[PDB]
Amino acid sequence: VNSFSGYLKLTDNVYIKNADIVEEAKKVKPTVVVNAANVYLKHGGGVAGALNKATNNAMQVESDDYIATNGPLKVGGSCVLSGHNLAKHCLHVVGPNVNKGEDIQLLKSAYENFNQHEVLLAPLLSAGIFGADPIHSLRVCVDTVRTNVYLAVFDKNLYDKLVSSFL
Ligand SMILES: CC(C)[C@H](Nc1ncnc2[nH]c(-c3ccc(S(=O)(=O)NCCO)cc3)cc12)c1ccc2c(c1)S(=O)(=O)CCC2
Structure with a gap:
């Protein structure tokens, strides 16, 4: 459960690793993976596109049903949906x-x-x-x-620039 490995602890609750979030999710299958989403949950590229591709478009089908029923999110907002094969949930x-x-x-x-x-x-x-x-x-x-x-x-x-600035 949440078997994160190779992270550097920066503070009591923030850890960091040089890694692809998709590869980390496949290895760890965490309780929650966060997606860097947009307000209409259209996962076209970048981190969102990579997470969606790794679910073979299941995340995009589910996101479209959420949008149809609930409307778009606001900037600064979130929703919890399935994490499919990557995690229990996707925030x-x-x-x-x-x-x-x-x-x-x-x-x-x-x-x-x-x-x-x-x-x-x-x-x-x-x-x-x-x-x-x-x-x-x-x-x-x-x-x-x-x-x-x-x-x-x-x-x-x-x-390396983030860790140098922080330490
Ligand atoms: C700052 C940057 C280094 C960071 N990037 C990332 N950070 C962590 N895990 C990542 N995976 C990928 C990735 C991309 C594409 C692909 S692929 O589908 O082309 N290849 C598949 C091979 O299995 C495969 C993984 C990117 C990535 C990041 C952090 C935040 C944001 C972005 C990007 S954004 O997507 O530009 C806009 C939303 C906010």
Whole structure:
């Protein structure tokens, strides 16, 4: 259960590893995997596309049914759906996409959703092509998340810059 390996503990509740979140989910089958979602839960590329491809599109079929019945999420919001073969549950969280003018204050609301789950495997919210400064996203995670979060960052260069900034 939640057999995370090779993480570096940064704080009492934040751990980090240079790894593909999809490979970590396949190995660990955690209780919760976090998806870096958008408000219509369309998993077209990046982390969301990779997690969806690893479920062979089951995540996308389920997300479409959630959207049809409940409507879109808001930026900073989340929903809990099945984790299929990757985890017991998938927590779809929408961080702001600064490359599109969404406010950075919503990154704190996005990480606050992690607090409803004791243990989570997660990506660094709003980083990559969402345009937020990735070291700033790690500072918001550290100051906002109180439950146990295991961050998988699939880039050794960025992992080293995050760990150098933190230590
Ligand atoms: C900052 C960056 C290093 C980080 N990336 C990632 N972090 C952690 N696990 C990751 N897996 C992949 C991946 C991609 C594609 C594929 S593939 O389907 O092309 N190849 C399949 C081979 O089995 C296979 C894994 C990316 C990745 C990240 C963190 C946050 C965000 C992004 C990206 S974003 O997707 O640009 C926008 C949403 C916010």
